Amino acid sequence: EVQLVESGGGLVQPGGSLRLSCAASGFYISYSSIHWVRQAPGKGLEWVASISPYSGSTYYADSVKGRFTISADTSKNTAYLQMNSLRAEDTAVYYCARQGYRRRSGRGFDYWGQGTLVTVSSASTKGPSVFPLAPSSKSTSGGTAALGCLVKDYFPEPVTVSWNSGALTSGVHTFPAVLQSSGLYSLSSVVTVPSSSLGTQTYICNVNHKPSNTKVDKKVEPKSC
Amino acid sequence: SDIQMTQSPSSLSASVGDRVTITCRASQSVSSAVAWYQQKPGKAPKLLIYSASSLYSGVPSRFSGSRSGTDFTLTISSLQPEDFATYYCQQSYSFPSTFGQGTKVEIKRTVAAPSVFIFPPSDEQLKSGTASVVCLLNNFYPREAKVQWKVDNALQSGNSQESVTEQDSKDSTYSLSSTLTLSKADYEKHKVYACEVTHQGLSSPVTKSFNRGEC
RNA sequence: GGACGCGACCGAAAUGGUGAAGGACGGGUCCAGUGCGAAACACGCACUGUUGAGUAGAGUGUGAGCUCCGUAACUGGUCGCGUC
Ligand SMILES: OC[C@H]1O[C@@](CO)(O[C@H]2O[C@H](CO)[C@@H](O)[C@H](O)[C@H]2O)[C@@H](O)[C@@H]1O
Ligand SMILES: Cc1nc(Cc2cc(F)c(O)c(F)c2)c(O)n1C
Ligand SMILES: [K+]
Ligand SMILES: [Mg+2]
Numbered sequence: 105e106v107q108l109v110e111s112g113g114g115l116v117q118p119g120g121s122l123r124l125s126c127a128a129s130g131f132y133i134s135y136s137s138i139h140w141v142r143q144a145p146g147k148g149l150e151w152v153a154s155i156s157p158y159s160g161s162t163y164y165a166d167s168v169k170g171r172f173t174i175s176a177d178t179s180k181n182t183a184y185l186q187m188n189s190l191r192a193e194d195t196a197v198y199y200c201a202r203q204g205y206r207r208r209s210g211r212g213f214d215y216w217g218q219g220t221l222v223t224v225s226s227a228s229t230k231g232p233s234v235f236p237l238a239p240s241s242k243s244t245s246g247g248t249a250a251l252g253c254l255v256k257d258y259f260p261e262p263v264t265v266s267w268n269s270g271a272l273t274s275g276v277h278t279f280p281a282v283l284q285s286s287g288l289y290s291l292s293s294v295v296t297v298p299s300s301s302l303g304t305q306t307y308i309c310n311v312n313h314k315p316s317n318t319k320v321d322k323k324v325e326p327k328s329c
Numbered sequence: 330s331d332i333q334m335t336q337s338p339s340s341l342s343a344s345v346g347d348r349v350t351i352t353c354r355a356s357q358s359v360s361s362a363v364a365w366y367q368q369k370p371g372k373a374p375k376l377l378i379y380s381a382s383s384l385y386s387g388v389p390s391r392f393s394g395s396r397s398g399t400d401f402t403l404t405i406s407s408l409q410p411e412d413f414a415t416y417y418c419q420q421s422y423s424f425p426s427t428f429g430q431g432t433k434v435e436i437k438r439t440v441a442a443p444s445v446f447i448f449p450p451s452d453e454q455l456k457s458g459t460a461s462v463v464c465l466l467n468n469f470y471p472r473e474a475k476v477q478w479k480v481d482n483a484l485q486s487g488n489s490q491e492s493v494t495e496q497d498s499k500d501s502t503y504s505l506s507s508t509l510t511l512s513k514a515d516y517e518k519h520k521v522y523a524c525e526v527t528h529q530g531l532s533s534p535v536t537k538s539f540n541r542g543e544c
Numbered sequence: 545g546g547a548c549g550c551g552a553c554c555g556a557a558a559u560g561g562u563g564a565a566g567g568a569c570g571g572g573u574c575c576a577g578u579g580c581g582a583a584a585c586a587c588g589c590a591c592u593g594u595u596g597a598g599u600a601g602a603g604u605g606u607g608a609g610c611u612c613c614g615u616a617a618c619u620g621g622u623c624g625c626g627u628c
Contacts, residue, residue, distance in 0.1 A: 135582035139426075149366075149374065149417055151426035159586040163424040166331075199373055203421075205582055208386065211421040212364040212379030219373060237448040237463055241544055245537075246444030246467065254461055254508075256454075277467070277504040279492040284510075291492065292506050294465055296444070329544045362584085423584080 105130035106215050110200050113220030115229060115260045115315065116190050124185040126200030126217060133157075133176055137203035138183045139213060140174060142196035142222075145261075150196070153185065154203070168194075190224045197221050223260040227287045231318025232258035234311050237292065238327040239302050248275075249302060251324045252294030253309035257286070258316070265293040266310045302326050332357050334420050336429030342437045342471070347408050351432045353418035355399040362422040365394055365403045368431075369414045370495050377416075378403060408434070413496070438501040442530030443469035447537040449522065449544065460516035464524035464537065466505040468497070475527040476507040480519045485509060517541070 112124040126138065140152040153174040154163045162174050173186040183200060197219040204214035237252035255263055265278045278293040293309055303326070311320045333356035343349050353363070361381040366374035376385045378394035381401055391406045405412055413436050418429040443466035450460040464476055472493065478485035493505045507524065523538035 132582085137584085141428075148430045149368075149419075149428040151419075151428065154424075154426075156583080156585060158583055161585050163585090165425045203584095204376070204379070206584085207580080207582085209376065210364070210380035210383065211362050211584070212376045212385060213366075213374075213419075214376050214385065216373035216375070233454070233457070235451040235454045235461070238451070240446070240448075240539075245446055248444075250444070250446040250465055250467065252448075252463075252465075254451075254454075254463065256461065277494050279494060279504075279506050282490050282492050282508075284490070290508070292463055292465075292508070294446075294467070294504075294506070296467060327544055421584080 106202070108200055108202065108215055108217035110198060110217040110220040113198065113222050115223045115225065117226055118191055118224055120190050120224070122187045122190060122222060124187070124198055124200075124220060124222070126183040126185070128181045128183070128202075131202070132178075133181055133183055133202075134178050136205075138174070138176060139201045139203060140185045140198060141201055141213075141216075142198045143219075144193075144196040147196075152198070155183065187222070190222075192224050194224045195222060221261060225260065225287060227259050229316050230257065230259045230288065231313045231316035232256060232263060232290075232311060232320070234309065234320045234322045236322060236324045237294065238324065239297070239299070241326065241329050244299055246296075248296045249299035250294055250296045251307060252292055253311065253322055253324060254290070254292050255311055256290045257284075257288040258290070258313050258318075259288045260315060261289055262314075263289075263291070264312045265291075267293070267295055268306070268308055269310055272307070330357070331425060332359060332420055332423065332427050334359075334418055334427045334429040336418055336432060338432060339430060340433045340435065342435050343408055344437045345408050345410055349405050349408060349434065351403045351416050351418075351434075353401045353403075353429045355401070355420055358399060359420040359422035361396055362420060363394075363396065363401045364419045364421065365392075366417045366419065367412075367414045368417065374417060405434075410436075435496055436501045438470055440530045441468060441470040441500075441502050443467055443474065443505075443526060443528055443535075445524070445526050445535050445537045447522070447524050447539060449539050449541070450516065455513055455516070458513045460511045460513055462509040462511070462522055462524075464507040464509075464526070466503075466507075466526060466528075468500065468502040468504060469528060469530060470502045471529065472503050473529070474505060476505070477525050478507070478509045479521075479523045479525065480511075481521050482523075 107129045109127045116122045137154055137156050139154040142150050142152050152165055152168055153172055155174045155176050171189045176183045199219045200217050201213035202215045204212050232255045235254040239249040239251040261281055267276055275296040279291045281289040281291040284290055307324045309322050335354045337352055363381045365378040367377055368374040377388050377392050381396040382394045393404050395402050413434055415431050415433045417431050420427050446465040448463040478489055489507050489509045491507045493503055520541050523536050525534055525536045527534045
């Protein structure tokens with residue numbers, strides 16, 4: 105019954121502003137403390153801000169003090185995080201959390217939203233170039249052959265990858281994106297397949313990058329040699 | 330002064346059914362205002378324990394917490410498959426709140442050698458001025474692995490990046506990509522591109538290579 | 545000896561004024577901690593604490609007691625005097 109949905113995330117340039125929303129359902133925020141907590145990719149949870157019930161008192165981590173303002177609108181049963189003068193290092197998934205009822209959960213945060221990704225960068229939005237990783241003319245490694253797709257130079261996160269429109273799932277490994285020195289992301293998605301069917305089977309990677317209105321389908325074939 | 334929560338170990342490999350303990354050490358008194366959370370990849374944290382030792386409603390009793398002064402422990406009495414995840418302590422005694430840096434709990438299994446594959450850059454990419462060469466290490470265990478690049482036998486350094494999957498849901502193996510980036514010009518100056526893989530499961534290090542012109 | 549009456553001295557419930565005492569005379573208020581109220585602070589309640597707090601009060605009590613100066617009911621004691 106109890107749920108939190110955060111929204112408003114996206115790409116902003118350093119110095120820019122962004123307002124996040126945390127829409128509650130199944131409870132009324134007025135009876136609870138509400139918190140924002142963030143997690144930069146590959147890093148730990150970092151407490152950002154909170155607002156206390158009844159008094160409206162607000163608290164902030166030093167890292168965001170003076171730039172961020174947390175608020176609560178009871179009419180929309182929604183909390184907000186207003187972020188000004190954003191910096192590269194503010195990049196993270198932003199979660200809002202309910203601090204639970206004292207008698208039942210002490211000061212534990214008992215419910216969390218799914219999170220919303222905030223990207224702060226000077227880099228411009230850009231869809232990926234997709235390149236084949238061709239199955240080798242050679243025989244085998246580990247019993248099979250391997251092929252895939254290189255999804256290079258997109259921004260910002262995320263991109264999704266599937267194979268044969270979701271029909272091919274076994275043996276698929278899609279790697280976590282890596283931020284390149286260019287400040288663009290890149291990743292590969294690979295799959296292992298029988299080596300004997302490389303000519304008569306079709307393998308297509310479906311790459312979707314919503315922020316740039318880019319969706320590409322690349323057929324991956326053995327190279328001409 | 331801000332309160333520190335020093336968490337250890339930062340990672341741990343265990344078998345299903347094992348008893349594990351994760352510790353967080355506060356740098357000042359936090360009374361008993363310590364909570365523990367579980368986080369799976371791509372998901373929000375979930376509350377397990379509050380006030381140091383109280384089990385959050387609906388959380389299985391194999392999870393327990395204890396306080397010894399300013400040291401706090403989360404114990405899983407007997408790990409089940411779904412318990413593999415990252416765990417975080419949090420002090421909320423005073424503002425600002427502090428989180429421990431986390432403990433990743435991963436599943437042990439038998440050693441598995443990587444299957445190795447190398448991929449030359451496509452012609453399409455080349456005609457755009459950059460060459461990406463990819464080395465794939467597939468379905469191995471444990472995580473620890475060494476991948477180095479050689480071009481015409483010269484050891485590369487600083488021009489490759491690695492990425493690794495989360496432990497696989499079925500076989501508990503890892504897969505890893507290493508990507509060597511070169512300008513088109515540098516790439517065309519050389520012939521032999523090799524990646525060399527060292528791993529506990531291999532009888533001896535494995536080299537996968539191609540010659541630039543030939544495929 | 546006794547009783548009644550008058551008066552004086554003493555005592556005295558009660559009352560006005562006075563000036564010292566701080567937590568072992570209290571209450572109030574504040575402060576701290578803990579728990580609770582859908583509640584970390586602010587607000588309210590409960591519990592705990594004076595090796596927590598001014599006897600210049602920082603009180604819409606400086607309230608009770610006392611120190612010290614008066615008024616004083618009397619069912620009080622004593623002495624004198626008048627009378628029986
Ligand atoms: O606000 C910084 C503060 O948060 C902690 C956790 O309480 O660290 C978090 O934020 C850091 C980013 O500055 C991350 O590097 C770290 O992984 C994350 O847990 C504290 O350690 C830090 O003082
Ligand atoms: C300074 C001040 N103290 C109090 C009361 C008080 C002080 C103590 F020290 C105690 O022990 C005690 F029981 C009561 C006030 O009302 N004010 C204004
Ligand atoms: K007093
Ligand atoms: Mg209070």
